[PDB]
Amino acid sequence: GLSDGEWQQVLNVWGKVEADIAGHGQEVLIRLFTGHPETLEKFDKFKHLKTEAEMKASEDLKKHGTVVLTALGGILKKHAAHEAELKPLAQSHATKHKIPIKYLEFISDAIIHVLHSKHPGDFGADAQGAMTKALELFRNDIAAKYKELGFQG
Amino acid sequence: GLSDGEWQQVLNVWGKVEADIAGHGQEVLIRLFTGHPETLEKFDKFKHLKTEAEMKASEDLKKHGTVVLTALGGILKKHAAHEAELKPLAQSHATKHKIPIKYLEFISDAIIHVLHSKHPGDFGADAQGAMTKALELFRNDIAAKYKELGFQG
Ligand code: HEM
Numbered sequence: 640g641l642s643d644g645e646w647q648q649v650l651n652v653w654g655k656v657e658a659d660i661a662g663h664g665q666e667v668l669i670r671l672f673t674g675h676p677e678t679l680e681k682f683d684k685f686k687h688l689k690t691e692a693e694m695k696a697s698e699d700l701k702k703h704g705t706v707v708l709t710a711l712g713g714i715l716k717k718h719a720a721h722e723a724e725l726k727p728l729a730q731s732h733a734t735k736h737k738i739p740i741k742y743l744e745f746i747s748d749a750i751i752h753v754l755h756s757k758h759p760g761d762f763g764a765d766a767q768g769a770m771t772k773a774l775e776l777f778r779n780d781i782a783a784k785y786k787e788l789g790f791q792g
Numbered sequence: 793g794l795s796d797g798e799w800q801q802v803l804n805v806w807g808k809v810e811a812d813i814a815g816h817g818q819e820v821l822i823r824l825f826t827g828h829p830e831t832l833e834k835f836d837k838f839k840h841l842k843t844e845a846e847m848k849a850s851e852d853l854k855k856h857g858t859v860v861l862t863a864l865g866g867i868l869k870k871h872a873a874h875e876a877e878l879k880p881l882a883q884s885h886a887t888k889h890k891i892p893i894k895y896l897e898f899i900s901d902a903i904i905h906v907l908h909s910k911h912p913g914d915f916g917a918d919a920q921g922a923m924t925k926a927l928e929l930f931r932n933d934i935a936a937k938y939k940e941l942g943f944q945g
């Protein structure tokens with residue numbers, strides 16, 4: 640896992656990328672295609688390109704390089720924002736509060752019941768099943784952080 | 793994982809909680825402590841409450857109810873926002889493009905290389921280490937989806 644300052648280092652350098660995404664995208668695919676030419680074979684519109692000069696001249700490769708870094712940028716920013724909220728929760732529940740995963744199952748059961756009983760119109764079998772799965776994802780994320788810190792519970 | 797409609801149910805359902813989070817929180821915690829009393833003994837500020845009467849009467853149990861459901865709401869929203877960008881990318885690259893994990897390593901190395909080259913000033917040893925881990929987490933997320941869909945990456 641990444642520390643708070645590491646995630647901030649990644650967002651910090653990604654700001655520099657987004658400021659000239661067209662050029663960065665170009666260089667990254669040329670770096671890919673020259674270093675590992677088997678990768679060029681997946682791209683119908685590019686596999687004809689033989690040299691760095693032809694690849695730099697390809698408007699298609701330029702535009703796809705931007706499509707790739709735009710998508711990556713968005714996914715890393717989303718990953719970082721999930722971690723900024725998950726990490727301190729996991730940290731405190733592990734080391735200070737000392738809450739076994741089982742107890743998080745208990746509170747998950749409670750959340751489902753209170754929701755069924757207070758908002759049954761908005762909480763059918765399908766929503767109840769959706770909310771059940773979402774709370775399992777939340778506990779598995781805490782659980783994957785508990786193993787990292789070596790918290791036994 | 794969950795379908796777009798499932799997440800939308802969870803998010804709809806969450807809306808009805810945010811209308812009265814104080815009350816919802818209070819009942820979840822009271823339902824938790826009555827059902828499983830060992831959970832009350834992790835709260836050094838609530839373990840003096842013996843009855844449901846004392847518990848409904850606690851200003852701070854109620855305020856802690858709001859803290860729990862707020863944080864849980866926040867984290868599930870960020871979880872869903874990450875998935876919504878991971879899923880389509882994993883889908884297309886597994887089923888249509890058929891891109892093995894190995895190739896995602898190559899493009900990861902290329903991004904790191906071009907950032908070392910073009911932006912040393914925002915990309916020293918620590919920042920490079922940070923990005924290396926961040927792209928590892930990205931590949932793992934993709935690899936986890938590859939398993940679900942049956943694609944051998
Ligand atoms: C960080 C890594 C990557 C990102 C963020 C990324 C992102 C994308 C995006 C957004 C698309 C267009 C929408 C889509 O089809 O899903 C795309 C298309 C594609 N990607 Fe990737 N990709 C990555 C790595 C790779 C690698 C390593 C390869 C091949 C070696 C690859 C091959 C392709 C191909 C063939 C297409 C279709 C191109 C076309 O039809 O014009 N991707 N990629």
Ligand code: HEM
Nearest residue numbers: 727728731736738742743746831834835837859860863864
């Ligand atoms: C959905 C599940 C849970 C969420 C979202 C959650 C969230 C939080 C938050 C945001 C805090 C305050 C910040 C912090 O210290 O980390 C907190 C504190 C705490 N949580 Fe949790 N929690 C959950 C489940 C549990 C369970 C099951 C227990 C115990 C059985 C527990 C015990 C505590 C304790 C003891 C504190 C310290 C309270 C104090 O001294 O004032 N949590 N929780």
Ligand SMILES: [Co+2]
Nearest residue numbers: 776777780871
């Ligand atoms: Co999560």
Ligand SMILES: [Co+2]
Nearest residue numbers: 718929930933
């Ligand atoms: Co991710």
Ligand SMILES: [O]
Nearest residue numbers: 703706707889
């Ligand atoms: O790509």
Ligand SMILES: [O]
Nearest residue numbers: 856857859860
């Ligand atoms: O909590």
